[PDB]
Amino acid sequence: AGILFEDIFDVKDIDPEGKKFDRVSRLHCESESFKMDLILDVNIQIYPVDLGDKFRLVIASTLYEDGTLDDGEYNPTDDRPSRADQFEYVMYGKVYRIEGDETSTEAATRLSAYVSYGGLLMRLQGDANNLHGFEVDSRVYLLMKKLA
Amino acid sequence: MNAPPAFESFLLFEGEKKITINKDTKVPNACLFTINKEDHTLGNIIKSQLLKDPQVLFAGYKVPHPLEHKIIIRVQTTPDYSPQEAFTNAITDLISELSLLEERFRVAIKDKQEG
Amino acid sequence: SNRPVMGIVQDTLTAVRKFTKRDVFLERGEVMNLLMFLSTWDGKVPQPAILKPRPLWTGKQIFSLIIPGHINCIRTHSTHPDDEDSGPYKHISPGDTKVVVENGELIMGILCKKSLGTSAGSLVHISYLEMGHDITRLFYSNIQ
Amino acid sequence: KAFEKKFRFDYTNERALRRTLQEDLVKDVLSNAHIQNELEREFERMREDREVLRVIFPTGDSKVVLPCNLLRMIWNAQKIFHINPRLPSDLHPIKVV
Numbered sequence: 001a002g003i004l005f006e007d008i009f010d011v012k013d014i015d016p017e018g019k020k021f022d023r024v025s026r027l028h029c030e031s032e033s034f035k036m037d038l039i040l041d042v043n044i045q046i047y048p049v050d051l052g053d054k055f056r057l058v059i060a061s062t063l064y065e066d067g068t069l070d071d072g073e074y075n076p077t078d079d080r081p082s083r084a085d086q087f088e089y090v091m092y093g094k095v096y097r098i099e100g101d102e103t104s105t106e107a108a109t110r111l112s113a114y115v116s117y118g119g120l121l122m123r124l125q126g127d128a129n130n131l132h133g134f135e136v137d138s139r140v141y142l143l144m145k146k147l148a
Numbered sequence: 149m150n151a152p153p154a155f156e157s158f159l160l161f162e163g164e165k166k167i168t169i170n171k172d173t174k175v176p177n178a179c180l181f182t183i184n185k186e187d188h189t190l191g192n193i194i195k196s197q198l199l200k201d202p203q204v205l206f207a208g209y210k211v212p213h214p215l216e217h218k219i220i221i222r223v224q225t226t227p228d229y230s231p232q233e234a235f236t237n238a239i240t241d242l243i244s245e246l247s248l249l250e251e252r253f254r255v256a257i258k259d260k261q262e263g
Numbered sequence: 264s265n266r267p268v269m270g271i272v273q274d275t276l277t278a279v280r281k282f283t284k285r286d287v288f289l290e291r292g293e294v295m296n297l298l299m300f301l302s303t304w305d306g307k308v309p310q311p312a313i314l315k316p317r318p319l320w321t322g323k324q325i326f327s328l329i330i331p332g333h334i335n336c337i338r339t340h341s342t343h344p345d346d347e348d349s350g351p352y353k354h355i356s357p358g359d360t361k362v363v364v365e366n367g368e369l370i371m372g373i374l375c376k377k378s379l380g381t382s383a384g385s386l387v388h389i390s391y392l393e394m395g396h397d398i399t400r401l402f403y404s405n406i407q
Numbered sequence: 408k409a410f411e412k413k414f415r416f417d418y419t420n421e422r423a424l425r426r427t428l429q430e431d432l433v434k435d436v437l438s439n440a441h442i443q444n445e446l447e448r449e450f451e452r453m454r455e456d457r458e459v460l461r462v463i464f465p466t467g468d469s470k471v472v473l474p475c476n477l478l479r480m481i482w483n484a485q486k487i488f489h490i491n492p493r494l495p496s497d498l499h500p501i502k503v504v
Contacts, residue, residue, distance in 0.1 A: 017357050023286040026357065039355060043288065043313055074308045076318075077202065077226050083381070091314040096363075096370055098493065106424035114354060116370045118312030118321040119285050121355055128380055135491070141314075174307035199292060204309065208299035222299060224306075265472070335482045367487050389479075 004133030004140070005033050005124075008147065011053045024051070024120065036126030040142075043120070047089045047144075058087065058143040059115075061133070072139060079137040088112075089144035093117035095134050115140050157217045158185050158242040169232070178206070178224040186219040187211065192222060197238040203229045267388045270381040275407050277306050279326075283374045285359050287322035288313065296319045301328060303401050327368040331398050336389045338362040338378040362386075379406070414448050414453055416500065427494045442501050449504055 013028035020026075023045045029038040038057070042049055049055075062069050063083040093115040100108040113134040114126045122142070124131070134140070159167060172178035183190070191209035198207035202220050206224040223231040266286050273278065281287070289297070298304055309328070313319035340360035347356055354361075362372025364386065372378075391399045419422065424433045436442055484490075 020358055021285050022282070023288070041285070044290075044317070046313065046317060065382075070310070072310050074310045074318075075205070077205070088316060091312055092310050092314055093312070094368075094370075098352075098367065100493075105420070118324040119359070119369065119371065120312065120321075127425065136490070137486075145339055145430070172306070178306065195295075196292075199295075206295060206298075208295040210296075210299045333483070333486065335479060335486060392476075 002064075002067055003058055003060045005130065006057070007036065007057040008032050008054060008056050009038055011051055011055075013047065014049070014051060021022045025057065031126065032131065034126060036124060037040075037121040037129075038125075039121075041088070041117075041120040041122065042089070042135065049146075054146060054147045056087075057083075059133075060141045060143065061138065061142075063141055070139075084143060086115065087143035087145045091117040091120065091142040091143075093120075093122070093140055095136055095138055098134055098136055099123055115142070149218055160185055172222065172224070175224055175230065176228060176245040177229075178222065181223075181235065183219040183221065185217050187217065191219045191221065194235070194238055197242055198223055198234060201225075201234055201238070202240075204231075204234050265385075267381050267385065267391060269388055269403075270376075270385070271379040271403075271406060276376060276379065278407070279379060281376045282322040282324065283326060283369070285370070288319040289321065289325065293316060294325065297325055298328070301405055303331065303405060304328060315357055323369040323371075326374070330364060330367045330369060330386070330400055331390060332394050333367045334364055334386070334389055334393055335366070336362070336364040336384075338372065340373045340387065341377055347379075356403050372383070378386045410457065411450075415450055418443060418446065425495075427495055428500075429497050432497070432499055434501070445501060445504055 004116040009031055011027050011029050014025050016028060023043060024041050025044045027038065027040045027042055027049060030036075031038070033122065049090070055137055064081045065084055066081065095113055095115045097114040099112040099114070101110040103107040108128050110125065111128045111131040111134075113131060115122045115124075158170060166184055168182045170182065171182045172180055188211070191211070195207050195209045198204050201207075203226045204223060205226060206222065209221045211219060221235075223234055225231050225234050270276075277297050294308065298308065309320070309324060311318040312321050312324055338361075340357070340358075340362065343360035344358070346360075347353065347360065356371060359371065362374060362378050363370045374386075376382075380387075382388075387399065387402065390402050418436055421433065421437060424436065428436065485492075
């Protein structure tokens with residue numbers, strides 16, 4: 001598998017502070033049946049998004065549908081493995097911080113994983129039980145698909 | 149006083165070779181072509197034609213100094229295909245396109261005048 | 264004054280900010296060219312950030328290839344407000360300030376005079392102190 | 408109070424110990440007494456250094472110029488050795504001292 005996370009989100013805001021960038025907007029999504037807030041920057045020129053949209057988000061450690069990793073080297077002439085091409089929007093990043101709700105003695109109950117997709121950041125808060133697949137410095141894919 | 153003559157930008161002198169082929173040892177199936185007395189007029193066409201090929205993984209060109217006339221082209225291709233074959237096919241396809249374009253322009257002139 | 268005496272001067276410096284904005288997405292051919300001008304390049308084209316519906320790289324994704332070795336640094340852009348560091352979004356930075364370089368990769372932030380300039384602790388100063396003159400020379404040339 | 412809390416190394420609570428240090432090390436820390444004496448002597452030395460610093464630098468200026476960048480060296484070590492900060496470590500504080 002290699003699918004670290006999978007959920008359906010709804011868009012609540014596009015730019016609460018304002019339009020900071022011409023071609024990039026920051027979605028403020030909330031989950032469904034998981035109660036996990038999301039803050040994602042999406043290229044809107046290539047992949048337009050507006051309010052109220054529902055998309056299915058998948059965060060996977062590999063794209064190859066069998067388990068093997070990719071080594072991070074770009075190669076377009078490798079259609080043989082039949083990668084996960086059922087999604088519309090795909091990004092590739094590196095998780096750089098896992099904040100938590102720890103203390104001196106008690107362990108954490110809520111985490112917050114940050115991933116940087118070459119500039120376009122993402123924060124994914126929620127419960128600490130379904131967020132266990134994330135380790136810092138690990139390459140991560142993001143896959144989106146709008147539900148009609 | 150130190151002005152180079154104008155013809156030095158397109159005339160090969162005694163000893164200079166037009167094109168020299170060197171391999172790239174960093175990555176497999178990579179090759180560098182050095183062309184003397186050329187510029188963007190050829191570099192750009194060859195690069196843009198190499199990029200059309202689906203078996204070419206890298207294709208670029210650069211002019212190392214504007215005061216020295218020399219073109220360097222780097223192409224890396226998928227295995228079971230060589231960059232020399234990619235280069236030769238690119239040049240052949242460019243020639244075919246230009247010949248077809250000239251034929252059609254000549255017929256268009258003929259249609260435009262006295263027609 | 265134990266600072267770097269030379270840094271990027273005003274034209275690569277007026278353009279590295281625009282390069283390192285978030286919006287800069289680079290096509291395949293543009294990436295080919297820019298890598299053709301890199302002297303310290305391994306030979307492997309990195310995976311694009313945006314992979315569908317069209318492969319797009321990013322300016323930070325190529326300045327990461329420019330930055331040498333494994334350099335760790337944290338600077339701050341010249342238009343960074345006085346509330347981001349205090350309130351929420353400390354590590355999310357809506358305006359793309361708070362430059363962060365981890366393992367020689369530009370994770371976030373916009374590069375300006377306060378990162379590539381001739382001030383103490385800048386990115387070039389860290390590159391010198393960590394790698395040496397022979398690598399800082401290539402750093403300068405490749406950036407330009 | 409902040410100085411003591413930040414630099415004391417409480418070895419009594421033992422829940423912070425189980426959370427931060429490994430299991431084979433927490434038993435050693437809670438059993439030995441020479442380790443505890445060394446750990447208290449370290450804080451004594453730090454307090455004396457604090458008083459010396461306050462004499463040298465009145466008006467409370469922390470900024471100083473020194474040859475080795477310890478924090479950046481620590482960051483480099485963390486990234487080089489792939490240290491995971493969410494797990495207990497195998498570093499003995501006596502080995503540190």
